[PDB]
Amino acid sequence: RVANLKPRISFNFFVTAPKNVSDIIPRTEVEKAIRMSRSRINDAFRLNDNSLEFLGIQPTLGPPNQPP
Amino acid sequence: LYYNTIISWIMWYLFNSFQEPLPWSDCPLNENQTGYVDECARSSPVDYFWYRETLNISTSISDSGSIQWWML
């Protein structure tokens, strides 16, 4: 569901059940659902997770191991 | 005497050269594979790498800490 469409590519959204629309998906599982496939969607629009802002979901990755 | 102490750190940072992500450029992480430690959060990553990296630091002059054996 799309609400408050902003030409600035910003809007608050939520998802429901498909057609048990009396009930919606609880957000607490959606937070881990995005963090699983967060890497999938930025390259689906050539973006960098600083153009995928979620305000509650942030990337928690990147330990470097350059030296042998 | 004590110029060669400074001169050794010129070579020490020269040993820390040669590389893609220069070591003072970035922060070390925390223990949770996430964002950074507090003194690299509260101040720049160029300094933090000085009070632990260049040398482990002490608070005062009256307390002698680690010997920095590889810096020796």
Swiss-Prot record, chain A:
Top-level taxonomic group: Eukaryota
Regulation: induction: Up-regulated in failing heart. Expression is induced by IFNA and IFNG. Exposure to cigarette smoke increases expression in lungs. Expression is decreased in nasal and bronchial epithelium of individuals with allergy after allergen challenge. IL13 stimulation decreases expression in nasal and bronchial epithelium. (Microbial infection) In airway epithelial cells, expression is increased upon influenza A virus infection.
Tissues expressed in: Expressed in endothelial cells from small and large arteries, and in arterial smooth muscle cells (at protein level). Expressed in enterocytes of the small intestine, Leydig cells and Sertoli cells (at protein level). Expressed in the renal proximal tubule and the small intestine (at protein level). Expressed in heart, kidney, testis, and gastrointestinal system (at protein level). In lung, expressed at low levels in some alveolar type 2 cells, the expression seems to be individual-specific (at protein level). Expressed in nasal epithelial cells (at protein level).
Biotech relevance: An engeneered stable, dimeric and secreted receptor with combined mutations that increase the affinity for human coronavirus SARS-CoV-2 spike protein shows potent SARS-CoV and SARS-CoV-2 neutralization in vitro.
Residue segments, region Essential for cleavage by TMPRSS11D and TMPRSS2: 27-46
Subcellular location, record wording: Cell membrane; Cytoplasm; Cell projection, Cilium; Apical cell membrane
Glycosylation sites: 20
Post-translational modification: Proteolytic cleavage by ADAM17 generates a secreted form. Also cleaved by serine proteases: TMPRSS2, TMPRSS11D and HPN/TMPRSS1. Phosphorylated.
Subunit structure: Homodimer. Interacts with the catalytically active form of TMPRSS2. Interacts with SLC6A19; this interaction is essential for expression and function of SLC6A19 in intestine. Interacts with ITGA5:ITGB1. Interacts (via PDZ-binding motif) with NHERF1 (via PDZ domains); the interaction may enhance ACE2 membrane residence. (Microbial infection) Interacts with SARS coronavirus/SARS-CoV spike protein.
Function description: Essential counter-regulatory carboxypeptidase of the renin-angiotensin hormone system that is a critical regulator of blood volume, systemic vascular resistance, and thus cardiovascular homeostasis. Converts angiotensin I to angiotensin 1-9, a nine-amino acid peptide with anti-hypertrophic effects in cardiomyocytes, and angiotensin II to angiotensin 1-7, which then acts as a beneficial vasodilator and anti-proliferation agent, counterbalancing the actions of the vasoconstrictor angiotensin II. (Microbial infection) Acts as a receptor for human coronaviruses SARS-CoV and SARS-CoV-2, as well as human coronavirus NL63/HCoV-NL63.
Family indicated by similarity: Belongs to the peptidase M2 family.
Swiss-Prot record, chain B:
Gene assigned in the entry: SLC6A19
Tissue: Robust expression in kidney and small intestine, with minimal expression in pancreas. Also expressed in stomach, liver, duodenum, ileocecum, colon and prostate. Not detected in testis, whole brain, cerebellum, fetal liver, spleen, skeletal muscle, uterus, heart or lung.
Impact after mutating residue 47 to N: In HND; population allele frequency among Europeans is 0.007; reduced transport activity by 50% but does not completely inactivates the transporter; coexpression with ACE2 increased the transport rate whereas coexpression with CLTRN has the opposite effect; does not affect interaction with ACE2; decreased cell membrane localization in presence of CLTRN
Name by which UniProt lists this protein: Sodium-dependent neutral amino acid transporter B(0)AT1
Glycosylation sites: 32, 56
Subunit architecture: Interacts in a tissue-specific manner with ACE2 in small intestine and with CLTRN in the kidney. Interacts with CLTRN; this interaction is required for trafficking of SLC6A19 to the plasma membrane and for its catalytic activation in kidneys. Interacts with ACE2; this interaction is required for trafficking of SLC6A19 to the plasma membrane and for its catalytic activation in intestine. Interacts with ANPEP; the interaction positively regulates its amino acid transporter activity.
Extracellular side: 16-66
Annotated transmembrane regions: 1-15
Positions spanned in the full protein: 127 to 198 of 634
